[PDB]
Amino acid sequence: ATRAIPELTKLLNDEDQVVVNKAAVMVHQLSKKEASRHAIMRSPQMVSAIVRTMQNTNDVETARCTAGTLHNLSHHREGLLAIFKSGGIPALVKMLGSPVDSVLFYAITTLHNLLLHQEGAKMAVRLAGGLQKMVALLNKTNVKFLAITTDCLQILAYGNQESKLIILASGGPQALVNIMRTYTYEKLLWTTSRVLKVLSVCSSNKPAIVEAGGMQALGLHLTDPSQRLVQNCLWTLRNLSDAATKQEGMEGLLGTLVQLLGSDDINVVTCAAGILSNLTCNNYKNKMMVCQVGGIEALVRTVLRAGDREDITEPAICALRHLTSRHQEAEMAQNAVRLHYGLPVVVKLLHPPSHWPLIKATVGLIRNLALCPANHAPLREQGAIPRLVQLLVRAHQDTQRRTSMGGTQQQFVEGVRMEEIVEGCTGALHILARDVHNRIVIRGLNTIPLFVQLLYSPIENIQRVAAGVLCELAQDKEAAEAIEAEGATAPLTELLHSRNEGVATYAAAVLFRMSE
Amino acid sequence: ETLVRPKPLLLKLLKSVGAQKDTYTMKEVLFYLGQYIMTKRLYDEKQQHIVYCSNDLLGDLFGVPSFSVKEHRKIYTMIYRNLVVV
Amino acid sequence: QVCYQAAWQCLSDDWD
Ligand SMILES: *CC(=O)Nc1ccc(NC(=O)C*)cc1
């Protein structure tokens, strides 16, 4: 104990740098026994001398004896105090810029211990610039070193925007992504995924991760045995999916996500459906690729299995919406839904107790399926037309009670705007009217007045679909009569000069049929 | 938005009616293709959904001399054939 | 020519 400690304390402080060498070495050997390290801890003078010399020396051997000394010091509650109250954290952060592996290991391990058991260490490391120093070290190769560094970032970034934005500004995203491409050590991959999940919550970090290629990199590990790694990757993947639907090199990720739809785990199904929904939203190539690997079949089975679970059906129906329009394989996808017995279940999602978002998505899917003539009669035989009229009527009559002459009080119900329901339902009935039997069913429900009303609507695309469905009806003589009787001549004429030239096309088409 | 870059075959026929760029949206391709057929007036007036393009470039770019406007999937297939998505 | 443009507009509606 206090026998050689004062004299060793008085030798780390010495203007001769040789003297501080053999000092530091014998203080290192000293720090290895509980009796001899207790005392260094209880001596405030010894601790800052170690820290001060560690941080200022240029000789290497002393720099890792001191660093190793503090590392031996960090295994005790009261050794973490002494390091803390002696300004060790700023010193340890400085040594993260050292070009010697031995010192680097001691410095990052002591910091790791302080961050884990010493309160106030999170803040101190942040003030000293520890995050920037740690992100820079992520280009090292030693697997165990990376795991300690990434866990330290996990500790500092959890629920702290400043730390996440600093990691973002320091170039953390691509480094964490590159670790996921390169390594197979589970413990490092899991820790790295924990940091990426934390960063993916902050929407500012999403483009950086995506751009680095984190989608493809995290998808690499959805076959990994460790399930804590998989669901961390899946969670992060779902959080990240709305940003960038413009990514190439996604063939393997998309194929794996379709396979994961058949998972025994039900939250894996939910995440996989939500990711596929976002990845298919605007992307021509992702659509062709999901279909090519049997995505339509898997998503239809996902909907059947889901029942009334709207956390599953809503994303799965949305994914099926995207895949049945505006790509080369849309005509297949429309048929595949019917051939895998999807038409009945798609229609009852229209009825209660579905909420408006699922109903809106289902209406949009039905509109796409109606583009296939083989679906016209089966959709009719499933009762789709009267249910679409039910939703259209309820949504239109809801807009009316909010329209007056100051416009319409724009509002949302369960995240949806009723105008969207009017738009999709009349659009769905527009495509369904291409079949003669459907037209008989449509008019049979006294809908011609309802559609005539929608011509005066101030929404552009509602004029689109209202004029469009009245067109199809008019190509039957006995229809064409009933529409003139309601008073369609006047508004249709002013629609003939619409910025939406498609509106003028149907408008003239109706006028040709009525009075010839 | 889906941007496409038409094959030189189809690019003549677009610029045949005053197209500008080398990439378009499907809306523009469908507009100019539509404008073309109405300028050439390739459609039969008895049933104006039939389009004979016997010795017109359209038949040369599509294949066959006489489709109908309402055979939608056959037309889009021929359209896709002359396109490269971006 | 209205009959033809209306048929062409049914065509183009599949890309909406
Ligand atoms: C979808 C579709 O093909 N509609 C349609 C509308 C009108 C006509 N022709 C006339 O009205 C004269 C054809 C097709």
Residue numbers in the entry:
A (entry chain A): 149 to 664
B (entry chain B): 25 to 110
C (entry chain C): 6 to 21
What did the authors write?
We screened MDM2-based focused libraries against β-catenin, a key component of the canonical Wnt signaling pathway that is often dysregulated in cancer. Finally, we performed x-ray crystallography to characterize the MDM2-β-catenin complexes induced by trimerizers H329 and H330 from C91 and H332 and H333 from C92. The calculated electron density maps indicated that residues 6–21 of H330 and residues 5–21 of H332 were well-resolved. Gratifyingly, all four structures confirmed Helicon-mediated ternary complex formation, with the Helicons bridging the p53-binding site of MDM2 and the C-terminal ICAT-binding site of β-catenin. The interactions between H330 and β-catenin include a series of intramolecular hydrogen bonds, including between Arg582 of β-catenin and Asp19 of H330, between Arg612 of β-catenin and Asp18 of H330, and between His578 of β-catenin and Asp18 of H330. Interestingly, Asp19 of H330 also directly interacts with His96 of MDM2, serving as a bridge for the assembly of the ternary complex. Finally, we observed engagement of H330 with the main chain carbonyl group of MDM2 Val109 and the sidechain of β-catenin Lys433. H330 could also promote the interaction between MDM2 and the full-length β-catenin. Meanwhile, by SPR, we found that H330, but not H332, could weakly interact with β-catenin in the absence of MDM2, while both Helicons could promote the interaction between MDM2 and immobilized β-catenin, but with different affinities.
